[PDB]
Design a protein around this ligand. Structure first.
Ligand SMILES: Cc1ccccc1-n1c(Cn2cnc3c(N)ncnc32)nc2cccc(C)c2c1=O
Length: 822
């Protein structure tokens, strides 16, 4: 059985576990055994949870960041139901009390013994929360749909739980010998080497002598650094670049000077080099796995004496306010001078003090660290800044994790993408962040779900495959059941890839109806019907994908030929009707980031009572240029609508009326007012989001509208002004906001108010977007490469201004945009 699990994991993670063994690496081995131990103890804890705690683990509450309403309620084992009237103020308990008295009366004759499932979804209502605090009940209001709920007993919940069972002495200057290498080029070769602590060099870089491109190179040269060996901090990182010169970069390679066991490295090392984009401090500290083809540099670390980094107990043994809200040297001197005053009176300015300490002097690092061990815990926002590559010391990293533990699950979920990216920064396999992520994943199935997929989606990238593979393995040890749920998802995705490939080939040799009918026959094979049906959605594990509806599946006969895959569920009713888009050929990372940031804006806006009626649909990279997009049904593109086709109800005298006619046709009579407002609200949201993010190239083809009037955006390709993008007001949208009229300053200025409110709210969390984007630099995204991209966000949110000035500025941008509209 242990054999079966091992092969299932291998298949799941896309890496054979045998590959871990073959490395004969003590660090990997230690990583695997400790992290197995921890994950198994988590599983143990879980299988004895109380039933409400179980639900909390498996179906975490979906909450929003008097009024009468109707709700249909039924019981698990019978199709008879009752439509109640309740208040949006009532708790689930009262609703459950109603349903039980109703059951008692029909059957002719304890609320606490139950939870309420949302029909056909893995979503549950429970706890002391008025129904409208639940996303599901609150959402049902706006659509006007009747909530459909199922009473589920504690014995039924516990059956689910049950079924899911499993030193200071050395003063001589640092030096290495560069022995030789084995590369390819056109000219002389040179090797540049530097020691770094984060972004900052600990001393000047040092270089080789020029040697001809012929070789198989041989250097035999000693490179000595302007830094004392006793001054090397724990996280010292030695960085190499190899290049050609008459500047023609070839390869790079980094290593920690200390290994994972606190020992200073000696003696000889062969460095399998990564092919180039000169010095790459942020690049991984492990060698290129393609040892067959990679360039390799052999160096010698000198046996300075075993010398371990000194322990904490030995470490522990050893005018201002103005600037404190980039700094000159004297200014730096004052911050350091007043470090105690920083701890006592400005604890949230920790990062700035860290950025002034001389990490290249051990006495000073000791002074800094001594204060850090007594330092008060910081707000979440501050902890996120401290995960930046600028702060590699694992005492700081420990400190940061420590302050990060107060993240709610919802917040953790919100920042998860970024935290995963920071793993790529890690100096060693076993690290606090990994342990933290795994623990939270093991405690929350939703967290566990997305952590899995964030890692899986990168297994094709050699610099991270080892790390991410080891983490996924450990997770699987902690949940055998969830592993099988995820295999089912990976099996569906393998089949979608094969189906997409077929469609791509077929569509070149034949017409769209011809390929569609062929697609359907492919899908109706037993192997496909089975693999594609009865799974949890990768986009949202609480959405169940029941029977694939073949007749409604199709593809876009253009570009990457993405697939449109529909599902239905009797048990979920109208809510069981959901679709996914499978796409293979495009990097989906940028789309996901963009959509998560828009979703963040919506959260922050809602936290201040502003609902801009946004459409935060799922987008999830799953593999090499592969992932899923959540279908928003009942929506069309502006371009399609603007095609202004005759023989329809939207057909107009003038093209500018097309969009309003379509809205009218979807929202008869009294419904029209509301659709126009939904349009106005979402328009303001998306106009502010795309402006703040620098998302240009917006046109009728990549904007959609729902039949409610909610506007939204698709196919994000370019952000942060990678084509300074102006604020955009489109005539046709302005035309709808103004209810069809040539002038309607009342409606248009209400619309301006929305934009201004949305914009000023985002400014107040300006720092949150900055720390998040900063962490994202670890992704490798080409439009998120350097300072210039971060700076885009500063200029968009006008952070260095008072709210008064920034608003003034935003207004000219807005006014300039109304001018551009005809
Ligand atoms: C639904 C639609 C209307 C007008 C123009 C394009 C599309 N559309 C779209 C537009 N679109 C992009 N993201 C969307 C999304 N998340 N929900 C609904 N439509 C979306 N996407 C497709 C993806 C795969 C396969 C197909 C056939 C489509 C597709 O037809």
């Amino acid at each position: 059985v242990k054999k079966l699990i091992n092969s299932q994991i291998s298949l799941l993670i896309g890496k054979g576990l045998h590959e871990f063994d073959s490395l004969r690496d003590p660090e990997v081995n230690d990583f695997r055994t400790k992290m197995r131990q921890f994950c198994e103890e988590a599983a143990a804890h879980r299988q004895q949870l109380g039933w409400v705690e179980w639900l909390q683990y498996s179906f975490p509450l979906q909450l929003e960041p008097n009024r009468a309403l109707l709700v249909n309620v039924k019981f698990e084992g019978s199709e008879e139901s009752f439509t109640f009237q309740v208040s949006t103020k009532d708790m689930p308990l009262a609703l459950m009390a109603c349903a039980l008295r109703k059951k008692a009366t029909v059957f002719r004759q304890q609320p606490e013994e139950y939870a309420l499932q949302v029909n056909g979804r893995h979503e549950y209502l429970y706890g002391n929360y008025p129904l409208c605090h639940f996303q599901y009940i609150c959402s049902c209001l706006h659509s006007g749909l009747t909530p459909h709920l199922t009473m589920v007993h504690s014995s039924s919940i516990l059956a689910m739980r049950d079924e899911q069972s499993n030193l200071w002495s050395l003063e001589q200057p640092f030096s290495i010998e560069l022995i030789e290498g084995r590369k390819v080029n056109a000219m002389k070769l040179v090797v540049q080497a530097g020691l770094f602590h984060g972004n900052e060099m600990l001393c000047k870089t040092v270089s080789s002598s020029e040697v001809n491109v012929c070789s198989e190179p041989v250097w035999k040269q000693r490179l000595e650094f302007d830094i004392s060996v006793c001054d090397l901090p724990r996280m010292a990182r030695l960085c190499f670049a190899l290049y050609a010169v008459v500047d023609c970069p070839i390869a790079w390679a980094n290593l920690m000077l200390f290994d994972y066991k606190d020992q200073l490295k000696t003696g000889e090392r062969c460095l399998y080099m990564w092919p180039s984009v000169l010095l790459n401090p942020a690049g991984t500290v492990r060698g290129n796995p393609n040892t067959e083809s990679a360039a390799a540099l052999v160096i010698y670390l000198p046996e300075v004496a075993p010398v371990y980094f000194p322990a904490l107990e030995k470490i522990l043994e050893l005018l201002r306010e103005i600037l404190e809200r980039e700094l000159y040297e004297h200014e730096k001197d004052l911050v350091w001078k007043m470090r105690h005053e920083v701890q006592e009176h400005f604890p949230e300015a920790l990062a700035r003090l860290l950025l002034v300490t001389k990490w290249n002097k051990h006495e000073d690092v000791a002074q800094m660290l001594y204060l850090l061990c007594s330092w008060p815990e910081l707000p979440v926002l501050s902890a996120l800044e401290l995960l930046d590559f600028s702060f590699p010391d694992c005492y700081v990293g420990s400190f940061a994790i420590k302050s990060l533990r107060k993240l709610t699950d919802d917040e953790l979920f919100q920042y998860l993408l970024q935290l995963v990216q920071v793993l790529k920064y890690e100096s060693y396999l076993d690290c606090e962040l990994t342990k933290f992520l795994l623990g939270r994943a093991l405690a929350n199935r939703k967290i566990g779900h997305f952590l899995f997929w964030h890692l899986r989606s990168e297994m094709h990238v050699p610099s991270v495959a080892l790390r991410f593979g080891l983490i996924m393995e450990a997770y699987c040890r902690g949940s055998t059941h969830h592993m099988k749920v995820l295999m089912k998802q990976g099996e569906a995705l393998s089949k979608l890839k094969a189906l997409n490939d077929f469609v791509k080939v077929s569509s070149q040799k034949t017409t769209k109806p011809q390929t569609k009918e062929m697609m359907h026959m492919c899908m109706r094979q037993e192997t496909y019907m089975e693999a594609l049906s009865h799974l949890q959605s990768p986009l949202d594990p609480s959405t169940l994908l029941e029977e694939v509806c073949v007749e409604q599946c199709t593809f876009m006969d253009s570009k990457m030929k993405p697939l449109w895959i529909m599902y239905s569920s009797e048990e979920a009713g109208s809510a069981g009707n959901v679709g996914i888009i499978f796409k293979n050929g495009d990097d989906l990372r940028q789309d996901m980031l963009t959509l998560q940031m828009i979703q963040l804006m919506d959260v922050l806006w809602k936290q201040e009572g502003l609902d801009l009626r946004m459409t935060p649909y799922g987008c999830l990279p799953t593999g090499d240029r592969t992932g899923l997009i959540e279908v928003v049904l009942h929506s069309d593109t502006i371009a399609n609508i603007q095609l202004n086709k005759s023989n329809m109800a939207a057909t107009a005298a003038f093209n500018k009326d097309a969009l309003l006619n379509w809205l009218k046709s979807k929202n008869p009579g009294e419904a029209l007012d509301r659709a126009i407002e939904e349009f106005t609200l979402s328009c303001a949201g998306y106009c502010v989001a795309t402006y703040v993010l620098g998302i240009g190239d917006r046109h009728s083809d990549n904007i959609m509208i729902r039949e409610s009037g909610q506007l939204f955006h698709i196919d994000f390709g370019h952000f942060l002004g990678n084509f300074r993008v102006p604020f955009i007001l489109t005539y046709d949208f302005v035309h709808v906001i103004q209810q069809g009229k040539t002038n309607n300053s009342e409606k248009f200025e209400r619309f301006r108010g929305y934009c201004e409110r949305a914009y000023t709210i985002l400014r107040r969390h300006g720092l949150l977007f900055l720390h998040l984007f900063a962490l994202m630099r670890a992704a490798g995204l080409p439009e998120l490469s350097c300072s210039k991209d971060i700076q885009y966000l500063k200029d968009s949110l006008a952070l260095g201004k008072t709210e008064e000035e920034a608003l003034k500025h935003f207004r000219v941008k807005f006014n300039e945009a109304l001018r551009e509209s005809w």
